[PDB]
């Protein structure tokens, strides 16, 4: 195999270095994978990738001069499960029309970029479960209302950690099946509004580690199985076990919290069905278990629940 600019192997095309100033129009429409690496590429033009029905993966990474992604850039790619946008330091603008219908999207990664706002995902409408991984983008300060609806008919994993997020509006997760939400390492994030989890199913896993979040929402956590709040210092109270009905695991900051959990039982509704059969673990859905697993456990001497 071969091509003018881009190196090629097995319908996988890699356009590298500085001689690539724009996306070659002569790229085979039977391409499985496209990678743009170390290009002096100021813009990615409208409908640039439209019309590769064979295209599974798109990598755009380490482009210092890239400032914009035009409208309808990712559209008509029924076979695209993976988009990866990494290390574009001058990219501040992603056109709200860039992300079009992509029924097969599994993984959208935007990491280490200039972008000032979350990407617009309401036209993606994926049939697959989607991992949205948006990280190390310091200029992203706020999450609007309905920021994730229409990303997928299937449940969703949202990693928004290590950003500059200071602001989360009510109903930011509305119209969304949330498996998992990681907001950790947004250091300036002070408050979750009481309606964050309105019209959202889940989360089942929530990570607010290393944020200044003061308080957890009173509703929306009826499905929470796993809570990770490490070095979350001004989160002092917490909902009562009766409000976190599903919680099985918590890794927290203040040991007194863990003692609150160890001291309040829960668990009857007998339970069912069929785990029948015939230093850590592996697969087991029997509901075998134990008071919430909690840490830090107030191990080193000391009581719990105060005096």
């Amino acid at each position: 195999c071969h091509h003018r600019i881009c190196h090629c192997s097995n319908r996988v095309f890699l356009c590298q270095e500085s001689k690539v100033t724009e996306i070659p129009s002569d790229l085979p429409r039977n391409a499985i994978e496209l990678r743009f690496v170390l290009t002096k590429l100021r813009v990615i033009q409208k409908g640039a990738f439209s019309g590769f029905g064979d295209l599974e993966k798109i990598e755009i990474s380490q482009n210092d001069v890239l400032e914009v992604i035009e409208a309808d850039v990712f559209s008509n790619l029924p076979k695209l499960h993976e988009i990866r946008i990494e290390k574009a330091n001058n990219l501040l603008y992603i056109n709200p029309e860039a992300f079009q219908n992509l029924p097969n999207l599994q993984y959208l990664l935007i990491s280490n970029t200039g972008i000032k706002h979350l990407p617009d995902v309401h036209k993606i409408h994926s049939l697959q479960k989607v991992l949205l991984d948006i990280q190390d983008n310091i200029n992203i300060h706020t999450i609007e209302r309905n920021s994730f609806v229409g990303l997928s008919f299937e449940s969703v994993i949202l990693w928004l950690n290590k950003n500059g997020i200071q602001e989360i509006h009510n109903s930011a997760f509305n119209g969304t099946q949330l498996d998992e939400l990681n907001l950790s390492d947004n250091n300036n994030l002070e408050e979750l509004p009481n309606d964050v989890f309105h019209g959202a199913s889940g989360p089942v896993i929530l990570d607010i580690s290393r944020t200044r979040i003061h308080s957890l929402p009173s509703y929306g956590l009826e499905n929470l199985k796993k809570l990770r709040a490490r070095s979350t210092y001004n989160l002092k109270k917490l909902p009562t076990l009766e409000k976190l009905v599903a919680l099985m695991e918590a890794s927290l900051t203040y040991p007194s919290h863990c003692c609150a959990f160890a001291n309040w039982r829960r668990q009857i509704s007998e339970l069912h069905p069929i785990c029948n059969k015939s230093t850590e673990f592996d697969y087991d859905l029997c509901n075998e278990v134990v008071d919430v697993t909690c840490s830090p456990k107030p191990d080193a001497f000391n009581p719990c629940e105060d005096i």
Binding site: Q62, N63, Y107, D136
Partner: protein, 89 residues
């Protein structure tokens, strides 16, 4: 020299029944870490001096089945070393 078996289809101990096994990609893939070259650092708004290239053993295709009493599981039909989604901090 540590004998790490290549990523390949195998038999899930749970979920599997005689005559009706379910196949699951598992094995080993190549990964490495080295200092981030300067040319890359130019492109990062958040400096990372160490760069890590990895790949993970995942199903390149699969068929959805229901077994055991209602468990939706995938029955992996093929395997390759591809993008790691879940290896991070």
């Amino acid at each position: 020299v540590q004998d790490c078996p290549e990523c390949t289809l195998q038999e899930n101990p749970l979920f599997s029944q005689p005559g009706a096994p379910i196949l699951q990609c598992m094995g080993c893939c190549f990964s490495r870490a080295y200092p981030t070259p300067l040319r890359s650092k130019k492109t990062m708004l958040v400096q990372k001096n160490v760069t890590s290239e990895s790949t993970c053993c995942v199903a390149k295709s699969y068929n959805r089945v229901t077994v055991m009493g209602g468990f939706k599981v995938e029955n992996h039909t093929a395997c390759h070393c591809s993008t790691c989604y879940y290896h991070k901090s």
